[PDB]
UniProtKB/Swiss-Prot annotation, chain A:
Disulfide bonds: none annotated. This is Small ribosomal subunit protein eS30. It is found in: Cytoplasm; Nucleus. It comes from the Eukaryota. Component of the 40S subunit of the ribosome. Contributes to the assembly and function of 40S ribosomal subunits. It comes from Oryctolagus cuniculus (Rabbit). Component of the 40S subunit of the ribosome. The modification N6-succinyllysine is found at residue 49. Coiled coil: none annotated.
From Swiss-Prot, chain C:
Gene3D superfamilies: RNA-binding S4 domain. This is Small ribosomal subunit protein uS4. It comes from Oryctolagus cuniculus. Belongs to the universal ribosomal protein uS4 family. Component of the small ribosomal subunit. Identified in a IGF2BP1-dependent mRNP granule complex containing untranslated mRNAs. Part of the small subunit (SSU) processome, composed of more than 70 proteins and the RNA chaperone small nucleolar RNA (snoRNA) U3. The lineage of its organism: Eukaryota, Metazoa, Chordata, Craniata, Vertebrata. One of its GO terms (biological process) is translation.
From Swiss-Prot, chain D:
It is found in: Cytoplasm, Cytosol; Cytoplasm; Rough endoplasmic reticulum; Nucleus, Nucleolus. NCBIfam families: PRK04211.1 (NF003254), uS12_E_A (TIGR00982). PROSITE patterns: RIBOSOMAL_S12 (PS00055). GO terms for biological process: translation. Residues 1-19 have a biased composition (Basic residues). Residues 1-25 are annotated as: Disordered. The modification N6-succinyllysine is found at residue 53. The modification 3-hydroxyproline is found at residue 61. The modification N6-acetyllysine is found at residue 134. Keywords: Acetylation, Cytoplasm, Endoplasmic reticulum, Hydroxylation, Isopeptide bond, Nucleus, Ribonucleoprotein, Ribosomal protein, Ubl conjugation. It comes from Oryctolagus cuniculus (Rabbit). The gene is RPS23. This is Small ribosomal subunit protein uS12. Hydroxylation at Pro-61 affects translation termination efficiency. Component of the 40S small ribosomal subunit. Part of the small subunit (SSU) processome, composed of more than 70 proteins and the RNA chaperone small nucleolar RNA (snoRNA) U3.
Amino acid sequence: HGSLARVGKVRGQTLKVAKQEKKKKRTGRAKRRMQYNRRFVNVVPTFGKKKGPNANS
Amino acid sequence: TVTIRTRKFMTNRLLQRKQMVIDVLHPGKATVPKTEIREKLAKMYKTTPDVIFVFGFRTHFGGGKTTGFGMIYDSLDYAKKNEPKHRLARHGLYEKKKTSRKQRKERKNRMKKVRGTAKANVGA
Amino acid sequence: PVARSWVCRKTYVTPRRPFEKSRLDQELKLIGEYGLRNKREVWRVKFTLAKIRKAARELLTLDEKDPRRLFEGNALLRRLVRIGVLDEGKMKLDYILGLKIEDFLERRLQTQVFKLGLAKSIHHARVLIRQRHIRVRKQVVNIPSFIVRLDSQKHIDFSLRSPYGGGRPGRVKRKNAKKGQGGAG
Amino acid sequence: GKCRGLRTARKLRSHRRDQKWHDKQYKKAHLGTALKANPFGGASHAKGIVLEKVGVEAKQPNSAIRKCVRVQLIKNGKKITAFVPNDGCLNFIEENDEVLVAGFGRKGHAVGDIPGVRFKVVKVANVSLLALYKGKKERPR
RNA sequence: GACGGGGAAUCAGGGUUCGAUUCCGGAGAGGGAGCCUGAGAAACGGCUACCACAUCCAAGGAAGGCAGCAGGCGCGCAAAUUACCCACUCCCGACCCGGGGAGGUAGUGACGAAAAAUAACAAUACAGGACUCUUUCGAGGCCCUGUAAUUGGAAUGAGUCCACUUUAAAUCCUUUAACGAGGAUCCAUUGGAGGGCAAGUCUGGUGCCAGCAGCCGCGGUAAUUCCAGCUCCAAUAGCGUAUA
């Protein structure tokens, strides 16, 4: 415990993990090209409500 | 292989000079220096290459065109009279005093410091 | 007092709604279709067309048989025909309001190079314009937002100092030839 | 409008001025009281010196303590109460350390569940609190 | 918390706010007062009286006013080189010929405005898409569409680096030699992911504690909102906060 209202308690006690090494992301014009690509021209005519890009249920 | 064309050519009898806007064509090469331009203007005007003065050459984007001005005189002394002194210094025919403005102004205040013939003596 | 200009103005306008689906999808579709960099360029084209439409509505507000209305209408009509987004058959002031933004995006240099047949894709066309390989009437262009005229569409071609249009080979070709001559001798 | 006479502009003008004075925002912006009692005095940011660190409580429907400091100003010397925003940034603030306070969001009004605090701190020891959070800059020694 | 105006922002139409600020006019050189010269001054880079402040001093006296250009202190959230030149524009003088911190030039400069790099092509990788078909199985995949640290070739730009050009001499831009990129490590950030409002009921930790939150609200030992990683959404060399 120590005390109740300690400053920096949760962030101090939070486990420290680092980044994962990855390639750089495409920036500038090709970011918009890939966004238009994935959003419009690689779709299939599904039914019902659409699924979000972060749906991981 | 460079070519020179003329534009807005006009003469001044009251300035004893000829004025024109020259067009320089140098494709596939960097900007030509002013000495070759002067020698070519001396060639096509049948003039000695000492009264030939060119200035202000701005290069276009892409390479091949450069717009400049040329000045054509008759004789050496009539060229020397009605000329800016910096173009004469570029040709090498004039030399200006080499001192900077701060010591000139301070020396002028030192002449202000005293009075008489010693005003020239205190400025050394 | 210094002798400068102090004159400048904005060329784009930010829309009032920042996050809604349909206009975001329409702008994103236009960016993807014409290979542009960001939303500021299509907002700039929309701003220019909005100013042209506002001027056309101001001229159409004023009544017929006036000198300034006929003068400015004929001037704006002649400019809008000569820029290449109108036809001589449609030589009327009330047809300015029917224009769309894609017509203004048609006369851009990037899509004109892409549609003429000098590049594979429109992104290849943009990285050809930015690369200084072509010229418009014996003078190279580097800017992809080069609007062209009706008499200037035919004269576009490759530049002299370019390996695609005939000239000195580039750096990588000369490096590979030097590597081949080093490996051979 | 009610007065619709052809030669009536004065009654419209004076009535519009009186009913504009019978307002809240126009009454606030055009009197010397709302700027004379203002701790910032028509300023966006201000510097100050911390003297005490006091933790004030929350409102009714939520339960927490809120980390705050007592700051005296430099230009006029009055006592205000600021609010350190982030998690665990009170350890960077020591006694008699100069800070940079700013507004809190609702134009001189209490925001959220913190009672009676209208200011928050941005920079301490002439460095930003965000750089102390992210491990970018270090306090001078 | 008033220099005025020509103006600026915002704007269906009507309006609201600002205008110290380069052009015009007015006022002052700490504050009042008086005056000489001169055509024109109550001039302050002219003089004189006062107080406030202040320099040197053998103590008797002598010398001053950066709200000019740089620069220093103080102040405050808040604002730059103790640089070069009269060559460009004009002004003044006995005057083509001398002077000009007026001015011009460069440096600092993410106030702001305009343009515009951070990739593309070719083949393999493996899923679909239009055409007579094989009900549904292989296939023309020759006509495509896409991304996976698969490979190989065409390209130029930042930066280093001669020259030329520009300029009073430069520097900057442009022209231009020889150099200069495969994960092209030459590595794009800023604020968010409950609703407003584009985008996870993903995983681990705390457990009305830490904290998030402009508003509604979220945390009570299974947090779609906290603290960290992955995925992603918005603008993009830009983004967020506070104020009028």
